[PDB]
Amino acid sequence: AASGTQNNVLRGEPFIRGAGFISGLSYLELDNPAGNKRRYSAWAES
Amino acid sequence: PHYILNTRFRKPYNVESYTPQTQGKYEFILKEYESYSDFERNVTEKMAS
């Protein structure tokens, strides 16, 4: 008899508040926890 | 005069104020779950007389 249970409940909710450049760092969430450097500088300028 | 993104705009007579606001919040909730189950039963019997 072999029994196995797997559960990976990983979630997030970034709060990024430039109107247009909001989407970038917030949607970069897939498999990229750390935000891009150049994208962060662009959002800072925006 | 009205300025939005280095562009000169016009405010009509009926609109009180139209100001771009940042107001950004996104949520991303991912779920992962797996379940395994296995069963095996060997049975053998022999009799000789």
From Swiss-Prot, chain A:
It is linked to Complement component 7 deficiency: A rare defect of the complement classical pathway associated with susceptibility to severe recurrent infections, predominantly by Neisseria gonorrhoeae or Neisseria meningitidis. The lineage of its organism: Eukaryota, Metazoa, Chordata, Craniata, Vertebrata. Monomer or dimer; as a C5b-7 complex it can also form multimeric rosettes. Component of the membrane attack complex (MAC), composed of complement C5b, C6, C7, C8A, C8B, C8G and multiple copies of the pore-forming subunit C9. Belongs to the complement C6/C7/C8/C9 family. Component of the membrane attack complex (MAC), a multiprotein complex activated by the complement cascade, which inserts into a target cell membrane and forms a pore, leading to target cell membrane rupture and cell lysis. The MAC is initiated by proteolytic cleavage of C5 into complement C5b in response to the classical, alternative, lectin and GZMK complement pathways. The complement pathways consist in a cascade of proteins that leads to phagocytosis and breakdown of pathogens and signaling that strengthens the adaptive immune system. C7 serves as a membrane anchor. Changing S26T: Confirmed at protein level. This is Complement component C7. C-, N- and O-glycosylated. O-glycosylated with core 1 or possibly core 8 glycans. It is found in: Secreted; Target cell membrane.
UniProtKB/Swiss-Prot annotation, chain B:
It is found in: Secreted; Target cell membrane. Glycans are attached at N42. N-glycosylated; contains one or two bound glycans. Not O-glycosylated. It is linked to Complement component 8 deficiency, 2: A rare defect of the complement classical pathway associated with susceptibility to severe recurrent infections, predominantly by Neisseria gonorrhoeae or Neisseria meningitidis. Component of the membrane attack complex (MAC), a multiprotein complex activated by the complement cascade, which inserts into a target cell membrane and forms a pore, leading to target cell membrane rupture and cell lysis. The MAC is initiated by proteolytic cleavage of C5 into complement C5b in response to the classical, alternative, lectin and GZMK complement pathways. The complement pathways consist in a cascade of proteins that leads to phagocytosis and breakdown of pathogens and signaling that strengthens the adaptive immune system. Heterotrimer of 3 chains: alpha (C8A), beta (C8B) and gamma (C8G); the alpha and gamma chains are disulfide bonded. Component of the membrane attack complex (MAC), composed of complement C5b, C6, C7, C8A, C8B, C8G and multiple copies of the pore-forming subunit C9. Belongs to the complement C6/C7/C8/C9 family. This is Complement component C8 beta chain. It comes from Homo sapiens (Human). The chain holds residues 202 to 250 of 591 of the full protein.
